[PDB]
Structures are given as C-alpha cells and as structure tokens.
Write a protein that binds this ligand. Structure first.
Ligand SMILES: OC[C@H]1O[C@H](O[C@H]2[C@H](O)[C@@H](O)[C@@H](O[C@H]3[C@H](O)[C@@H](O)[C@@H](O[C@H]4[C@H](O)[C@@H](O)[C@@H](O[C@H]5[C@H](O)[C@@H](O)[C@@H](O[C@H]6[C@H](O)[C@@H](O)[C@@H](O)O[C@@H]6CO)O[C@@H]5CO)O[C@@H]4CO)O[C@@H]3CO)O[C@@H]2CO)[C@H](O)[C@@H](O)[C@@H]1O
Ligand SMILES: [Zn+2]
Ligand SMILES: [Zn+2]
Lengths: 142, 382
C-alpha cells in the first residue's frame, strides 16, 4: 500500500480489497497495536474513520485509544462554540446537512442526536475547523 | 459579509496604534477609500473563526506560521505580485509566505530573538551558554541575576534546544516531512538538559514567564534577557542602558532561534482584493510606508531590500539579522500546532523534575505524531 491515491481509504473498501468481510477482518490499533475486538471493528466502520497506513500496513484504532486522543485534541485545539440555530444560520443548511462528529468517539451525529442538542440547548464545538457535538452513547458515559 | 469600497485591517496593537493608520490615511487621501486599522484581542484566533463564515478584515497581519493553516482552510486569497515587485523583497521572506506552491501573504518584516543585555551590570555579554552559571554566582553576590527570559513558550526555549541538533519538521526537496520531527534526538536532549540544569542549579526559575522576565530586566534586576523587537519600546521607556547582541553558543554551535516573518494576508472572502494589493504593494511596502510604521514601533529587519539596507546601521537590527541567519524559519504547515503543544508540555514536565529530559522529549515526539495520526483517522472532511 505505497500510494494514497490507490490504497483503500475506509474499512468497507479494505474488506473488498482483501476479499474478506467486516465480520472476519483482522485489524490492529495504530496506537497500542492490540488487535481490535469484533465490536471495535464495527465501531470503526460506524464512525466513518480512515484506515491509517504505517510501514505499508493498514491500521484501525481501538475505542480507548481513540477517546484518549480525541480528549487531548479537544483540550488543545478547541476554538469556539455555537448553539444549533446559530450554526444553521452560519452555513444556511439544516444540521442534518452538516458533518458533526462526536467530540469523544468521533461518530458522525445522527439527526436525532443533533435534535437533542437543539432541545437540550447544548452547544456544538469547533475544534480547529471541525464541528463536534456528543452522541447518545457518550452523553451517558464518555 | 465584508463591506465593499473600504479596507478593514487587523494588526496587533504593539506593532503600532499610529504607524499603519498613517499609511491608511495617505491611501484614503489618494483614492478616497476609507482605511480602518483595528487591534482585536486574540486576532490570530478570531480570524479563522470569522473568515470561515465569509466575514472578518480585508487584511490580516500576523507571524507567517499561522498562515499555512489559514490557507489550508481556504481563508486567504492567492497573492499575485509581478516579477518587478517580487524583486523588491528578499527571496526567503517570499518562501515563508508560500503554501502548496502559491504565495498566500505579503512579507513585511523579519524577526528573531536576540540576547538583550544591561551594559551597566554586564559590559561584555557572554558568548557561550556554558559561562552563564559562573556569571550568575558572581551577580547573585551583588543581589542580581545573570539571565531571565520567558520559559513558558516553546518559541523562547527553542534557540537553546535546537542549537545542537533539534528541528521542528525536516525540510528536503522543497517539502516538509510531517513524519520527521526532530524533538527526540541527541541535540534537543543536550539543549533541554542544559536549560533544566540551569533551573535545578537555581540560575533560573521554572515559573518565569514573559511579564516576570520583562519586569526584571526593565527594573535592572537581571543582567540579561532573551526577547525580540516587539520588546525594545518598553526597554527604551525603562531607560536601562541596553545592548542587543548575538545569542550565546551552545556546545560551540550557535543558538538556532525560530525566524518569524510578519505577513499581511488578504481575506479570501474580501470584495476589496484589488484595493488590498494596491495598499500593500504601493503604500505599505515602500521606504515611506515602512518608515511610518517603524518610527512608531520597530518591525525588526524589513522584507523590503531598500529600507532594510537603510536600517541595518541599527546594531539591534543587525543582531536580529545575525540571529535570524543562524536560525530556523518557522514551518507554516498546519501540523506545527501538534509540535508547539508537545514541546511546550515537554519543557514544563522536564523543568518540574517530575520526568527526565529524555523521557519528556520522547513523549513529545510520540504525542505530536499521535495528534497527526488522529487527524489522519478523521480525514480532511469538515
Ligand atoms: O490560559 C491558559 C494558558 O494560556 C496561555 O497561553 C496559551 C495561549 O493563550 C494560546 O493562544 C496557545 O498558544 C499556542 C498557539 O496558539 C500556537 O499557535 C503556538 O504559538 C506559536 C506561534 O504561533 C508562533 O508565531 C510563535 O509566536 C511568537 C511570535 O512569532 C513572536 O512574534 C513573538 O510574539 C510577540 C508578538 O510579536 C507581539 O505582537 C506581542 O503581542 O507579544 C508576543 C510575545 O509574547 O513571540 C511568540 C512567542 O511567544 O511561537 C509560538 C509558540 O511559542 O503555540 C502556543 C502554545 O505554546 O496556548 C497557550 C497555552 O495553552 C498562558 O501563557 C498559559 O500560561 C496558560 O497555561
Ligand atoms: Zn489502541
Ligand atoms: Zn460518542
């Protein structure tokens, strides 16, 4: 996997290339190098994350390492916050048309999660150009 | 929405509350176009926030390192100077404002940290870092200290850390290699060990920041400080008989400070891009324009060849240039934010004595690389 203009970018294309399924693929975390649990493989795909190549090998990320680094990033690279309505007015699009990832797990927020923010009067955070919120699972426990 | 037929400029207040405004007044007299100079708080942070919505100033003045990140976010207009205009400014200043093969700002002035010394306490400043502990023992007996400078910002501690071999990102084949960080190496370890030993031997204090160092030097309590041209004006007011010189050597090698280029970027959302190029090229970047700004607050070593030659006779500007030539241009790549925070933490952790220098630097290279890996996991989509 030499050039990035060829090698599979996301998990579904990687499965296709190896001629395997998401139920069978063996992946390791880019950080800790521990093999991902089957549930973590599914979460990597749900989070719409990119496969990261190191020394010509594909790597994913485990749940614990992703949350660890996502927290350090928010801490250091937080820019500013807006209420959902102000964000909609800024880009002249409903929240459903914007890419808002969970600040903790990176999962792109569902329309229901974006609506919870509006109802609960919870702000969205800008992390150096990236808009973030909080998913249902991370709203329970991060 | 930015207002058409007018120019709004953002510059830091310590670059002059009169100088640039005066150039703006000459532009208004000639064109009829109103020029408004503003000094917002945290303008380098306010700019990427407002400009992302198609708002903000027409022109932004800041150090070049932040410009790569603004250009990556599509916030800056590509600048189009003709060959004859490009010729009036030094090539390395144009290199500092080049992002992904395009010019993204106009270079104004070149800055680097220098060794600032009190001529009354210290007529001959030390040429080496290694002689500073012996100098401190002599001065402590007189109720003074040898050196006091900001230890909080990695920009200030870098001259010494980089001296024997440290670097931010490797530059080869006209490109920065984001995987080649030079924090965890023998050079950076030697420099930081010397810095931390100064703190351990009580020649410096880990809590020393900008304000503490400035007050100490300007009150004649410390024989030396490390600062840039933005600090000279307060030293002038203090009436301290000061000298600005070459930074001390470490292990026989010169201190490698970062080199900053004050730059003027045109907002990509501005409807006044032609007015902006006109003002920057034909009003500001002239001997007359830079003199109006410089007489208010010194810029350092100007990018404009003609005026730099005229100012070079100031020994403080000659020291700024000598240090900049021995220095390292700050990379303008957005990946620099990963570097800055990792190094900042390393210095704090090592200086506290809660971790060894080597372990702190190893953690800094791991941490900077980890932030960049996270960005790669997320992708460029926003
Ligand atoms: O409240 C908690 C916390 O806050 C304080 O510091 C934090 C700070 O407010 C925050 O903005 C951030 O800073 C980051 C930064 O965003 C990064 O971009 C990076 O900064 C580097 C910078 O981009 C470089 O250009 C370079 O800056 C140089 C300049 O190039 C020089 O011109 C010179 O600036 C002078 C300037 O010209 C004048 O106009 C005048 O205004 O004063 C300036 C001098 O003070 O010097 C600076 C260097 O200081 O180098 C920068 C790197 O050092 O990296 C920053 C992080 O280190 O993060 C801070 C921490 O979270 C506060 O200080 C803390 O004690 C506190 O913990
Ligand atoms: Zn892991
Ligand atoms: Zn989440």
């Amino acid at each position: 996997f030499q050039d990035p203009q060829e090698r599979p970018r996301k998990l579904p294309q990687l499965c296709t290339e190896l001629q395997t399924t998401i139920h069978d693929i063996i992946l390791e975390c880019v950080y800790c190098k521990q093999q991902l649990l089957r549930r973590e493989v599914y979460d990597f795909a749900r989070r719409d994350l990119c496969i990261v190549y190191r020394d010509g090998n594909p790597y994913a990320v485990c749940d614990k390492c992703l949350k660890f680094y996502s927290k350090i990033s928010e801490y250091r690279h937080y820019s500013y916050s807006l209420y959902g309505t102000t964000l909609e007015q800024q880009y002249n699009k409903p929240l459903s048309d914007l890419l808002i990832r969970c600040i903790n797990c990176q999962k792109p927020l569902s329309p229901e999660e974006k609506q919870r923010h509006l109802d609960k009067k919870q702000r969205f955070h800008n992390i150096r150009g990236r808009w973030t919120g909080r998913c249902m699972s991370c709203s329970r426990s991060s | 929405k930015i207002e058409e037929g007018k120019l709004v400029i953002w510059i830091n207040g310590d670059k002059g509350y009169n100088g640039l405004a005066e150039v703006g007044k000459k532009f208004e007299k000639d064109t009829g176009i109103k020029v408004t100079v503003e000094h917002p708080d945290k303008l380098e942070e306010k700019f990427p926030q407002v400009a992302a919505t198609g708002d903000g100033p027409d022109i932004i003045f800041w150090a070049h390192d932040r410009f790569g990140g603004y250009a990556q976010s599509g916030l800056l207009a590509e600048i189009t100077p003709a060959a004859a205009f490009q010729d009036k400014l030094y090539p390395f200043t144009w290199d500092a404002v080049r992002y992904n093969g395009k010019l993204i700002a106009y270079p104004i002035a070149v800055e680097a940290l220098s060794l600032i010394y009190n001529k009354d306490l210290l007529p001959n400043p030390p040429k080496t870092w290694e002689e500073i502990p012996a100098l401190d023992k002599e001065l402590k007996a007189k109720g003074k200290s040898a050196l006091m400078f900001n230890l909080q910002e990695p920009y200030f501690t870098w001259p010494l850390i980089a001296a024997d071999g440290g670097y931010a990102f490797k530059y080869e084949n006209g490109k920065y290699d984001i995987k080649d960080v030079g924090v965890d190496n023998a050079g950076a370890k030697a420099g930081l060990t010397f810095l931390v030993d100064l703190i351990k031997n009580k020649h410096m204090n880990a809590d020393t920041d900008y304000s503490i160092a400035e007050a100490a030097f300007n009150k004649g309590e410390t024989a030396m400080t490390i600062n840039g041209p933005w600090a000279w004006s307060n030293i002038d007011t203090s009436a301290v008989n000061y000298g600005v010189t070459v930074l001390p050597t470490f292990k026989g090698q010169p201190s490698k400070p970062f080199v900053g280029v004050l730059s003027a970027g045109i907002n990509a959302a501005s409807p006044n891009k032609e007015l902006a190029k006109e003002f920057l090229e034909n009003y500001l970047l002239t001997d007359e324009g830079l003199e109006a700004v410089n007489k208010d607050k010194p810029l350092g070593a100007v990018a404009l060849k003609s005026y730099e030659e005229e100012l070079a006779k100031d020994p403080r500007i000659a020291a700024t240039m000598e240090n900049a030539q021995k220095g390292e241009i700050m990379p303008n790549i957005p990946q620099m934010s990963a570097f800055w925070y990792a190094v900042r933490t390393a210095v704090i952790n090592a200086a506290s004595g809660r971790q060894t220098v080597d372990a702190a630097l190893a953690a800094a290279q791991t941490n900077a690389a980890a932030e960049l890996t996270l960005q790669e996991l997320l992708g460029e989509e926003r």
